[PDB]
Paper text:
[name] (LayV) was recently found in shrews and isolated from febrile patients in China, representing the first human-infecting HNV from shrew origin. HNV infections are facilitated by the attachment glycoprotein (G) and the [name] (F). Upon G-mediated receptor engagement, F is triggered and promotes membrane fusion and viral entry. LayV F and G are closely related to MojV F and G but distantly related to their NiV and HeV counterparts.
However, [name] IgG, but not 3C4 IgG, bound LayV F, two mAbs elicited through immunizations of mice with MojV F. These results emphasize the close evolutionary and antigenic relationships between LayV F and MojV F, which share 90% amino acid sequence identity, and their distance with the rest of the HNV genus. To understand the molecular basis of [name] binding to LayV F, we determined a cryoEM structure of [name] Fab-bound postfusion F at 3.5 Å resolution. Local refinements of the [name]-bound membrane-proximal region and of the membrane-distal base yielded reconstructions at 3.4 and 3.2 Å, respectively. [name] binds to an epitope located in the membrane proximal region of postfusion F forming an HRA/HRB six-helix bundle. Both heavy and light chains contact HRA and HRB burying a surface of ~700 Å2 at the interface with F using hydrogen bonding, salt bridges, and shape complementarity. The [name] epitope comprises HRA N141, N144, and N148 from one protomer and HRB E466, D467, Y468, E470, K471, E473, E474, F475, K477, G478, and N480 from a neighboring protomer. All these residues are strictly conserved between LayV and MojV F except for the N144S substitution, rationalizing the [name] cross-reactivity. Epitope substitutions, including the E470LayV/K475NiV, K471LayV/E476NiV, and E474LayV/R479NiV, likely explain the lack of [name] binding to NiV F. [name] Fab recognizes prefusion and postfusion F with affinities of 35.6 and 1.30 nM, respectively. [name] is thus unlikely to be neutralizing although it could possibly trigger Fc-mediated effector functions as observed with polyclonal antibodies in NiV-infected hamsters.
Residue numbers in the entry:
A (entry chain D), B (entry chain E), C (entry chain H): 1 to 107
D (entry chain B), E (entry chain A), F (entry chain C): 135 to 186, 448 to 481
G (entry chain G), H (entry chain F), I (entry chain I): 1 to 120
The structure:
Amino acid sequence: DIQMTQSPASLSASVGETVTITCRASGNIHNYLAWYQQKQGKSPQLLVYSAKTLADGVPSRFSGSGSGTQYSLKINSLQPEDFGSYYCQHFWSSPRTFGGGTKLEIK
Amino acid sequence: DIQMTQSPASLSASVGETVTITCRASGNIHNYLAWYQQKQGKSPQLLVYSAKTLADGVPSRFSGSGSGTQYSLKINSLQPEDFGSYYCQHFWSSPRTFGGGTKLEIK
Amino acid sequence: DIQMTQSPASLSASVGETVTITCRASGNIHNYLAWYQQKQGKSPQLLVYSAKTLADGVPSRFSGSGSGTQYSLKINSLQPEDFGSYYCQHFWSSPRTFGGGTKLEIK
Amino acid sequence: NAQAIANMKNAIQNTNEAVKQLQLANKQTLAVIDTIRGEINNNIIPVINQLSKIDIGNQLAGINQTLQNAEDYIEKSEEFLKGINP
Amino acid sequence: NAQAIANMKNAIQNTNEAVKQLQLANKQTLAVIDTIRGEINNNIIPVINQLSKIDIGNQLAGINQTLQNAEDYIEKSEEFLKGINP
Amino acid sequence: NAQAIANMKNAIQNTNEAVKQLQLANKQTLAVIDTIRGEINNNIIPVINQLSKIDIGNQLAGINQTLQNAEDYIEKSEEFLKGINP
Amino acid sequence: EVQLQQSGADLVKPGASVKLSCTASGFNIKDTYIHWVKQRPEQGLEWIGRIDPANDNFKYDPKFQGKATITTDTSSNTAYLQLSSLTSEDTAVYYCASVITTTGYALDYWGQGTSVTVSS
Amino acid sequence: EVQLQQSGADLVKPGASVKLSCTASGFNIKDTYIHWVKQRPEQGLEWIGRIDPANDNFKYDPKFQGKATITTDTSSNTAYLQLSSLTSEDTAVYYCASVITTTGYALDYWGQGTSVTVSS
Amino acid sequence: EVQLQQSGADLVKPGASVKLSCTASGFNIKDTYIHWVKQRPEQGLEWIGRIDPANDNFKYDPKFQGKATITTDTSSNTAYLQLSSLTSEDTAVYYCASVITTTGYALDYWGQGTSVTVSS
Ligand SMILES: *[C@@H]1O[C@H](CO)[C@@H](O)[C@H](O)[C@H]1NC(C)=O
Ligand SMILES: *[C@@H]1O[C@H](CO)[C@@H](O)[C@H](O)[C@H]1NC(C)=O
Ligand SMILES: *[C@@H]1O[C@H](CO)[C@@H](O)[C@H](O)[C@H]1NC(C)=O
């Protein structure tokens, strides 16, 4: 199968800082990678899809890129509302699993 | 090949009655079944196609359904004009043969 | 590979005459044949494509037809501007090579 | 309808990639057949000559029907395409 | 958008022709397999009976993965087509 | 043009089904190849060892050309699809 | 509008050859399939076969493979059915049918039919 | 508008069976894929599996293949997840998710989630 | 409008390397194929090869496979032909050509051509 590795377990940054989250694959995903965000509660929502795009309604603060088995998400000018958990998953073949996820805290 | 069996050889009904005509396949037709009607003379015309639809111009009195190798046509509230011969044929692969046909008489 | 043979090496005709240019293939091109024209200088331009059509802007004086491995171009009512070099090439598979070409002179 | 165009384009491209993968599988299959032929021709036959049933009919029949089904589906595909010109 | 329709139609037709060619390759492959079986069954086995390893595991594994990739691509094709109805 | 969209969708779906059928044919073909290998490896080789040509070049050449044609058709399919973006 | 105009009324002797035909109006033959059907006086319908005029690609029900063939002339929007070795069973009514709107599913338009009989 | 309304709040004993469900609004189930995801309280997300309502074509992550199944009722635009042999690990939050606009790329719409717990 | 602007006028010694180039205007290189053709002064046209800028997928006529290569820079809408080991035969005129409207059938747009000569 194809598994996802979310490298950063936890990030710590103040408001206005720039952070990055990296995600690697155990196999070739053919760019079918998507990123999600979740708050302390509620359901997750889609932020970036196709690993090079933005989901509708998402601020320009969020971007990303990648190829092969190496992908990443960038967050510029962090605002208080941007702090939460991030996940990566792929849509190639099956199972369409998730990475462990990264928690970004304010500090 | 795939042959069609038209089970009723002949039906007899009065006006206002409800009748049914059943047709079975010797093989899987993948729902490509169509029903035709013919008068004592003239050419036949298309009444139902895709075995779950109506042909344009056909009264709501005519309907049908089915799956696999088992299909049927229903005629509700028979009117004098509805009495004639019915046929079933399939459009899967080749030959696209016909069933024996059913004759519906007024009585 | 598939090679093109341009049979006429050179043609000689006066203005108002009708000439033809024939081109044969060493293999089946599936009608992906196109004809080009070049002046004494400058780049070549597309005159007929798909071996049965006209390129946009090309006078009705130019036409052609063919099938299999045998194709031809016809030029009716030659005008002074129609005298130059003609080429044939195919777009099937690879290499997409050219025929030797035919030179049509005024005389 | 612009999205429908985009979706059909992506669907066609994925169909073509699947075809490429089957072609590769067929080339690899021939390599296997030739490998078996090689061993038979190189060792089994020469040794027997120096010294001096296989029934797969049911499997071949199964394959023949599967290949026929592929033909039945392509023929239907072509019939639908003719309805585009109108 | 009329040109897009024309281009997709031509693209589909060429896809279908490629499929027909693979089917033919498969029929020819069976003829080869049967030819080899024929020689084994007709001469090799009878001679050995009168008188009285092949390791391709790595090649078969390669073929199995190639065929699986073909499945992964078709599945993706179907997902895109569902977006047409909207 | 709504009917053209519907017809292309149905045509693509039938193309994909034909591809699935060829994949199945290839899996069945491998089963046949392995069955033949099995009998050779299990009985023919051991017996010869206890006791102690196949020419298909023309058929393989025919298959190689058929597979190449499939490539020529897919390449043409891709060229047409590029004309959709404009 | 779209219609098929069928013609013929051939009265022939046993062993004779017969050519039946239909013409199209309202559509181009090249874009459709043409099917032929044989109706014996009191015995239902038998499909004969069909052609694709775009490339003269024909297919027949094996029963009639050695009995009749189907051809066409695209340039005039016409289609033909050629019957050979006519005998008593062949007396019948033949129909020209085509698929116009119900593409991929069903015969749509039908001609009025042509009657051919065989007698001494 | 488009949304998924998920329901359930099952408190069960070990060994019990649980059925969780979601309903669709704003779209037809037949035209989309339905996915289910399991979130243990503090351990990220595990994909369970999905179905295609058009033909009841299901696929599951091998980990849960013998643990849960996914079904549907197209006529009511609903979907169901059936869990069996519930134990302590299963306490969690389950989500109903679907692909609506981002076809072929990503889960788009999510339900609010349902919490199921197992206790003595 | 759509056009190809070709450049170069290289006068080199035998054994030298030469890079010829063209730029696009009116269209995106990523959506088209770029072909190169070699015209010796009086000997017709030889096709060299082509590339697909979307993925740098190249294909060459075997005759020039060890003689020249074709590359690209999508971000600037440009294309390049790199010739190596130039000798007397190479003196010629090279053309940049592309397929814009006549997709799948024929070279449509051509540059004016670039002349490269080899001398002592
Ligand atoms: C399977 O089809 C081939 C033709 O492709 C034929 O030669 C062979 O005899 C068929 N096998 C059987 C068991 O009929
Ligand atoms: C390859 O796949 C087939 C099933 O199609 C299976 O029977 C065979 O054992 C597999 N080969 C290997 C090496 O696992
Ligand atoms: C057929 O093609 C294969 C490569 O796929 C090659 O190894 C083999 O030698 C070719 N057969 C012949 C007769 O050239």
